[PDB]
Design a protein around this ligand. Structure first.
Ligand SMILES: Cc1ncc(COP(=O)(O)O)c(C)c1O
Ligand SMILES: Cc1ncc(COP(=O)(O)O)c(C)c1O
Lengths: 385, 386
């Protein structure tokens, strides 16, 4: 044979112990690890459908929606975003985007690829959108769809959502919201806030492993996706097929693709955990953990990148890189000496920030203390121009 | 709150003990279960990249390729097929498809959606392509890409592959092969056989959980994907981005999407297990387990759907549904009474066949015997038309 068994593969798997305090993925609690170690069941068995149905109820709970077109996307946060866009948007459709961070920039990229006429509302990192600004975009561009990031994990921003749905609906625009970083960490009410498409991911405050994502569509969104003149560019993400297999339509489930059974166990357990805790209690925990972190970072002489506390995303905090340091030095020091992962910036915030995540079971004052101690040490050991 | 905590989630997760002898997914051996129970590491950590590098080596081993553009797709087998098509095919490209089962039909569907000029070579379930049939399509349709299913798990057919890559190259056509159901279970040699795009899935003979897939691209395929004057319709599956993050190009790894860290542990362990067994040993195991199943099925009075033994896929065996039975009765009998899963047909083979899988750790004499006794029972106790 051309290729021999890889020597490295003949060694056993060995992973380091890391406290993951960046913007995700987050460490896994015991129940979620335990679920990940379970045996397979048939991907189209009655028992699998029951688990799926329970996951659906769980998503409806954490999104606060009664939308029946609610399901799991078999891919990461990006894949749920792509699923929303390739299904809602048809070539030529006007697409208004909140490009105030990497996530709006990604929505622009996807939208251009699938033929939308994309209209970015570009805002410096750290900014958020007002009702006035969005209405100017609706006036100008008459979009079929608005994208807004709820939790801007690249900039640390918590985007207000009240009023945007009603505004979009007046202009016959659908409202698409990214809650990958905000879900479970901060108030969110899909139906009350008139959101038409809402997606999140498994690996942020839910503390499930990365690889799945959560999505829900309103009746107005469904009407668009189900009256397209062309098929979506994606078969894997075609919502008509996915809606059927997830039991969201009035037909028996037909095979589309094999769902990630073991990941669905773990997701089920992550939704059970937050259902046990209670949404509002989870919001409380994150709010207070972030407030504690903010004060500890400030005591170090560090400056929070988002100055208005009301606009700070509890789950991902941005810290202005301290003058004189190489942020890469700080990030490396924190993992190398304290086995804690934090991150620098991303997209427009690249080079400008450090990012510290407080996600679910890892949103604790203990972890705030750990990362604060590690940052303190990095500031006095990392070289300062 | 509009929605209160679902009471069903407040109960513990419980799963039944099922022997999965369908065409996939397969049961997990203990080492793969154990990998899936591990703690997280950073998704862009040095240690993660090492694990990715080892998985890449494991893919190059099981595919038998030295292609540097080899990586995991963060999606099921369908996602790897879509990744191949959306990156290789530009709107208007001629696309020749071996449409001899559901997998060719799905390639047609994707090709149509992404604006290719699709030319199906249609065949009835059980059919396979000869070199002369493919050359007639290559001459008539001038394709930039041919899709062939290697292991046609919906029909039980093993498509010969020798010489198809060379033939395609003579017509300046890329060869894309689906080996989701064949990999590990039957001979396959990506570079030797001139295959330009090869993909497989995690949940068949590798016995990993479903949801990841394996893909490799030749330099000829890479040239086409990196030479197009349109961006692919997908960001999530854009090969330029994926190649970078998987360490296949000249640039620092950039964040694209978060890879499924835990699934990569388990996929890594699955590649380690087959690297421990040895490809050829795995081929022998499957060949012998299937030969045994074929004998035991025929001794029951059942007819194998693929009449030419050389065309029989070891990993997935199609059986004619016996006259007078509702195949649904047989399949439900077997899971309801024995906790054994088998399947009916799929796409064109629906209603025509039962499908029995022998995949990796499940490809054993003991499991052939269990399914044989289950079918014996089902034949004795399922209603037969008057
Ligand atoms: C707000 C936000 N949106 C989208 C994503 C993308 O998720 P993924 O990395 O899982 O594709 C992330 C990581 C995120 O924080
Ligand atoms: C040959 C073959 N191709 C493709 C698929 C689809 O794979 P998945 O369900 O993982 O998307 C299967 C199941 C298969 O046996």
């Amino acid at each position: 044979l051309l290729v021999t068994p890889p020597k490295a593969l003949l060694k056993p798997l060995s992973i380091p112990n890391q406290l993951l305090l960046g913007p995700g993925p987050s460490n896994l609690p015991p129940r979620i690890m335990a679920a990940g170690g379970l045996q397979m069941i048939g991907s189209m068995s009655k028992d699998m459908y029951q688990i799926m149905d329970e996951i659906k109820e769980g998503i409806q709970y954490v999104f606060q929606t009664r939308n029946p077109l609610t399901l799991v996307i078999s891919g990461s946060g990006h894949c749920a975003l792509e699923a929303a866009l390739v299904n809602v948007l048809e070539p030529g459709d006007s697409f208004l985007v909140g490009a105030n961070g990497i996530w709006g920039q990604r929505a622009v990229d996807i939208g251009e690829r699938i033929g939308a006429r994309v209209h970015p509302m570009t805002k410096d990192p750290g900014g958020h959108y007002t009702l006035q600004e969005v209405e100017e975009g609706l006036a100008q561009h008459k979009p079929v769809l608005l994208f807004l990031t709820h939790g801007e994990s690249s900039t640390g921003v918590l985007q207000p959502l009240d009023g945007f749905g009603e505004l979009c609906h007046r202009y016959k625009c659908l409202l698409l919201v990214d809650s990958v970083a905000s879900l479970g960490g901060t108030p969110l009410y899909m139906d009350r806030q008139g959101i038409d498409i809402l997606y999140s991911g498994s690996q942020k405050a839910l503390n499930a492993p990365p690889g799945t994502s959560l999505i829900s569509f309103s009746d107005k969104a469904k009407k668009k996706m189900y009256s397209r003149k062309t098929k979506p560019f994606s078969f894997y993400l075609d919502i008509k097929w996915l809606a059927n297999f997830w039991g969201c339509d009035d037909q028996p489930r037909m095979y589309h693709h094999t769902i990630p059974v073991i990941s669905l166990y773990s997701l089920r357990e992550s939704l059970a955990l937050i259902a046990e805790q209670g949404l509002e209690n989870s919001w409380r925990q994150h709010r207070e953990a972030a407030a504690y972190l903010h004060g500890r970072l400030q005591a170090l002489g560090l400056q929070l990148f988002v100055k208005d506390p009301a606009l700070r995303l509890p789950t991902v905090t941005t810290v202005a890189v301290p003058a004189g340091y190489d942020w890469r030095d700080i990030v490396s020091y924190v993992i190398d000496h304290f086995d804690i992962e934090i991150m620098g910036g991303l997209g427009p915030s690249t080079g400008k920030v450090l990012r510290i995540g407080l996600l679910g079971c890892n949103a604790t004052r203990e972890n705030v203390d750990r990362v604060t101690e590690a940052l303190r040490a990095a500031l006095q050991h990392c070289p300062k121009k």
